Amino acid sequence: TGRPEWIWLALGTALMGLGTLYFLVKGMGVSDPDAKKFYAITTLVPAIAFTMYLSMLLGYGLTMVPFGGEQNPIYWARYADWLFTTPLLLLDLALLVDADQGTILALVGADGIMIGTGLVGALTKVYSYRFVWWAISTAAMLYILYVLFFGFTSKAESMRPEVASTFKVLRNVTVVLWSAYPVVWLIGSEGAGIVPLNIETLLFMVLDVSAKVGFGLILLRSRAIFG
Amino acid sequence: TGRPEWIWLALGTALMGLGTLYFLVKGMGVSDPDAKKFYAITTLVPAIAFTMYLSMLLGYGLTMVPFGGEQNPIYWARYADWLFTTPLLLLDLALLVDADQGTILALVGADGIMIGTGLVGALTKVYSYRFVWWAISTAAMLYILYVLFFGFTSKAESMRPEVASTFKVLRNVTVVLWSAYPVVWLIGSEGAGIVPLNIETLLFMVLDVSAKVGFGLILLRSRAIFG
Amino acid sequence: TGRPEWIWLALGTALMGLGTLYFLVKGMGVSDPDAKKFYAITTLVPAIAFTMYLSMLLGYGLTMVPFGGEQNPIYWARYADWLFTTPLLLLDLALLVDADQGTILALVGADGIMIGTGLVGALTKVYSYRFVWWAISTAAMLYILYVLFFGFTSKAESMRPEVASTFKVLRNVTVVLWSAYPVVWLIGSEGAGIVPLNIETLLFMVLDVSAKVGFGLILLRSRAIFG
Ligand SMILES: CC(C)CCC[C@@H](C)CCC[C@@H](C)CCC[C@@H](C)CCOC[C@@H](CO[C@@H]1O[C@H](CO)[C@@H](O)[C@H](O)[C@H]1O[C@H]1O[C@H](CO[C@@H]2O[C@H](CO)[C@H](O)[C@H](O)[C@H]2O)[C@@H](O)[C@H](O)[C@@H]1O)OCC[C@H](C)CCC[C@H](C)CCC[C@H](C)CCCC(C)C
Ligand SMILES: CC(C)CCC[C@@H](C)CCC[C@@H](C)CCC[C@@H](C)CCOC[C@@H](CO[C@@H]1O[C@H](CO)[C@@H](O)[C@H](O)[C@H]1O[C@H]1O[C@H](CO[C@@H]2O[C@H](CO)[C@H](O)[C@H](O)[C@H]2O)[C@@H](O)[C@H](O)[C@@H]1O)OCC[C@H](C)CCC[C@H](C)CCC[C@H](C)CCCC(C)C
Ligand SMILES: CC(C)CCC[C@@H](C)CCC[C@@H](C)CCC[C@@H](C)CCOC[C@@H](CO[C@@H]1O[C@H](CO)[C@@H](O)[C@H](O)[C@H]1O[C@H]1O[C@H](CO[C@@H]2O[C@H](CO)[C@H](O)[C@H](O)[C@H]2O)[C@@H](O)[C@H](O)[C@@H]1O)OCC[C@H](C)CCC[C@H](C)CCC[C@H](C)CCCC(C)C
Ligand SMILES: CC(C)CCC[C@@H](C)CCC[C@@H](C)CCC[C@@H](C)CCOC[C@@H](COP(=O)([O-])OC[C@H](O)COP(=O)([O-])O)OCC[C@H](C)CCC[C@H](C)CCC[C@H](C)CCCC(C)C
Ligand SMILES: CC(C)CCC[C@@H](C)CCC[C@@H](C)CCC[C@@H](C)CCOC[C@@H](COP(=O)([O-])OC[C@H](O)COP(=O)([O-])O)OCC[C@H](C)CCC[C@H](C)CCC[C@H](C)CCCC(C)C
Ligand SMILES: *C\C=C(C)/C=C/C=C(C)/C=C/C1=C(C)CCCC1(C)C
Ligand SMILES: *C\C=C(C)/C=C/C=C(C)/C=C/C1=C(C)CCCC1(C)C
Ligand SMILES: *C\C=C(C)/C=C/C=C(C)/C=C/C1=C(C)CCCC1(C)C
Known about the structure:
The structure is a homotrimer. By secondary structure, chain A is mostly helical. The first copy, chain A, has one domain (1-227): Rhopdopsin 7-helix transmembrane proteins, CATH 1.20.1070. Helices cover 74% and strands 4% of the residues of chain A. In chain A, strands 1-2 form a two-stranded antiparallel ribbon. In chain A, a hairpin with a 4-residue loop joins β1 (63-66) and β2 (71-74). The termini of chain A are far apart. Chains A and C meet through α2 of A and α4 of C. Bound molecules: a molecule of 4 linked components (GLC-MAN-GAL-L2P) (3 copies), ligand L3P (2 copies) and retinal (3 copies). One ligand L3P sits between chains A (100, 102-103, 106, 109-110, 113, 136, 139-140, 142-143, 146-147, 151) and B (17, 20-21, 24-25, 27-28, 31, 36, 39-40, 43-44, 47, 50). Chains A, B, C: Light-driven proton pump.
């Protein structure tokens, strides 16, 4: 239920919160117009994650969903967080590699579908169907990781070595991180109950902090963001 | 009620789904930077339509609304679909004719109002009021079709003949299609019950497929999208 | 409750409505590409405010929220209105002063957080918590007003005198207006009950009309919008 995992929600709230604080301070004296955007996109991610986590901790981001034949606690705020967060992360990778507009809109359009479809599946009352959505959602993710891995990498090979290499790191980091979500979702209480909500929450917590603080850290402390 | 029309929802789900598949494959080997955006915008439309239709078919996109003095099944997913879909269609017409930013924001701003206001009217419990919203919504649509017909046409006359002519086709096609919605809505169960939900669903189904697959077809198979 | 203040909702609906009408007509014969965007952004604000107010008047934008130990009428449509409105107002100030993209995304990202967080607090059932959100929301606002006052002003000093001065006016006007919201919210039925809903509604009404009609008036009637 929504009680014993409060500690993961509390610890995550704190980390995202501190995560925002640091980026804000770190980006204080940046004049480079390029880096400026990077700081904006990257700082906005943990900030949002902060408010969504706090809402899960205080209770607002938790709802109840019946399926299988029981009342299941679903943290919808997770999706609300991701819905705005993932596009930004994507935007970072794109600026860095200088992606085309068509491809950005495609990636972003695909991303909303991944989360929207994911949320839908989390709120679907027919236990069976929940897995269709998971499927459609995961497909969208693969499309995104495909374009990021091959599409972007190829695009980064024309950038100066600092960029090509920083991106590479971020590339591997996102590919590994992003794919853990559909797996965590699948084994957690939202899907095939194989791991308790308490663990599910902890797993997503580590994943969210890594994706919104780690990623930012790796990027914002690189020279790559300077034009 | 929400049962006998399942077949229109199923057939539509299939068409949008196939609609996405084809565009994805067709845009596979496109290198032209212009066409690329076109494929992105146009492919994203049926994809979204796919997920929204599937949700109506599985039951998620259906809700119940009391008014007149009864429980009325309202497919809110239709609006959710249109909310993201219409801006994109508009974006296509704009890129094609090279519209100004002010006019795009205006058209898009007007579009959200058309759908938002339409949805509101679909969820309004006071039977009487439902028609005010329909009115406000239809006004917004007219504003859009006005700008598209005169504003854009004039803008397309400066483009190469392929563009001016392709646009023209799309222009007539959207003007005719878009205006059928406020009429279908008005005579269907969501408004003045003159046609059963079963027909209403079928009518919107034909309209959605034409607007998201036909339009894409006409455009994506034209030379117009190449810079 | 949601009845005696209907007059403020009615009067506001009317003003926003007339507000849109005037801007539409005033921007009819504008050819300047710069001014065009300004008219678009500025006209779209009262239009949205119109639909949201009308929804509060008709009843749709009102909901009930228990907290403190009672049923409290909460006009969520206020937040829905602001959510789309404030970014636009911000966009106006930015175009006028020629702000960077990083700073716009930052301001807009901060703005959504201010409203999103504000709405959350308005729907939070735990009376106590409602004030945390108010706090987080108000912080975001200060961040925005900070950047607008110092950041933008500095940016406007490089524009021609008409712009620098018009902006200045708008600058003082928004700083004074925006900060009245968190105060009105705090003393109204949504926070520390010190003023009845009837007054709260009237206060926000004056504030919304000033922000969406006054601001537009001051700006749209200035030469500043011409490139
Ligand atoms: C700028 C754009 C153009 C912005 C877009 C903003 C918006 C559309 C995004 C929201 C995202 C959506 C996708 C997620 C929503 C999920 C939704 C399906 C689930 C609904 O719940 C959330 C919603 C409703 O709350 C409710 O208010 C109603 C009206 O008063 C009530 O009727 C509902 O019942 C109420 O729901 C709550 O309470 C339920 C409680 O039940 C109780 O539980 C207790 C437990 O102890 C006990 O059991 C009681 O007995 C029992 O009754 C609970 O179960 C429900 O779950 C729920 O809590 O809330 C509003 C969501 C808010 C808008 C999201 C915050 C968003 C953040 C702050 C925005 C920052 C983003 C900016 C925009 C990005 C900037 C950068 C860009 C450039 C990318
Ligand atoms: C990127 C942006 C910044 C993105 C914006 C995303 C978001 C804000 C868009 C959503 C759009 C809005 C406008 C439409 C919402 C309509 C809303 C008013 C209606 C609410 O329903 C939908 C919502 C809630 O579902 C629910 O979960 C709650 C929490 O757990 C519950 O409390 C609710 O009750 C529950 O509602 C469901 O179940 C009801 C069931 O009742 C039962 O019915 C059965 C029938 O047999 C039987 O009778 C039972 O007895 C009875 O109890 C049902 O009646 C309700 O209708 C409902 O099903 O769901 C969330 C919506 C989801 C977010 C929309 C999918 C969006 C897609 C995938 C996004 C793709 C878009 C991208 C963003 C675009 C990219 C391109 C751009 C560049 C343009
Ligand atoms: C383009 C983008 C990518 C666009 C984004 C659009 C979208 C996501 C934005 C919405 C914004 C969100 C943030 C606000 C939502 C607040 C939400 C938490 C609160 C929920 O209520 C609103 C929602 C649901 O209505 C409902 O339908 C459900 C399904 O059928 C029902 O299950 C719900 O119960 C029902 O809720 C209503 O009714 C309740 C009634 O109870 C009754 O009250 C009477 C009183 O006499 C009596 O007591 C009865 O006994 C009692 O039962 C009531 O209490 C509830 O409050 C509610 O009324 O409605 C949908 C919202 C709609 C989408 C917002 C309008 C938006 C406008 C028109 C859009 C214009 C914006 C464009 C996009 C901007 C363009 C420019 C850009 C460039 C910046
Ligand atoms: C519990 C808490 C931990 C959680 C926090 C609560 C949180 C929810 C509320 C905060 C809002 C937050 C969400 C918003 C974050 C936005 C973030 C994305 C911003 C990234 O930042 C990008 C830039 C925006 O661009 P700029 O103004 O154009 O830069 C000017 C530069 O000098 C170039 O000038 P040139 O062009 O002429 O050459 O920030 C502008 C740079 C400015 C010069 C510096 C601004 C000063 C700041 C006000 C101070 C930094 C903040 C401090 C850590 C204090 C924290 C208080 C906070 C809560 C307001
Ligand atoms: C039930 C089903 C029917 C429904 C489908 C399920 C669906 C919900 C999930 C899929 C996600 C979908 C919503 C997302 C669609 C996005 C769409 C808008 C994309 C449009 O496409 C635009 C471009 C993006 O731009 P680019 O990468 O920059 O192009 C590189 C070019 O070579 C130029 O290089 P240069 O600049 O150096 O000169 O697609 C990039 C071009 C790439 C080179 C080609 C990419 C290969 C693709 C992975 C293969 C195409 C897909 C296949 C049909 C397989 C379908 C599987 C799908 C489910 C993932
Ligand atoms: C906080 C930041 C990130 C990087 C969040 C990423 C989230 C995902 C990649 C989620 C993926 C999902 C899939 C593929 C299918 C089931 C539902 C999920 C939303 C968990
Ligand atoms: C799927 C694509 C398109 C082109 C959808 C278009 C939808 C409309 C033009 C809807 C118009 C409406 C009006 C004008 C008023 C009543 C409600 C509607 C939303 C149906
Ligand atoms: C209609 C236009 C404007 C300018 C609306 C502005 C709204 C705000 C500045 C609201 C601020 C809030 C804060 C800071 C905290 C409590 C909740 C509010 C949303 C009222």
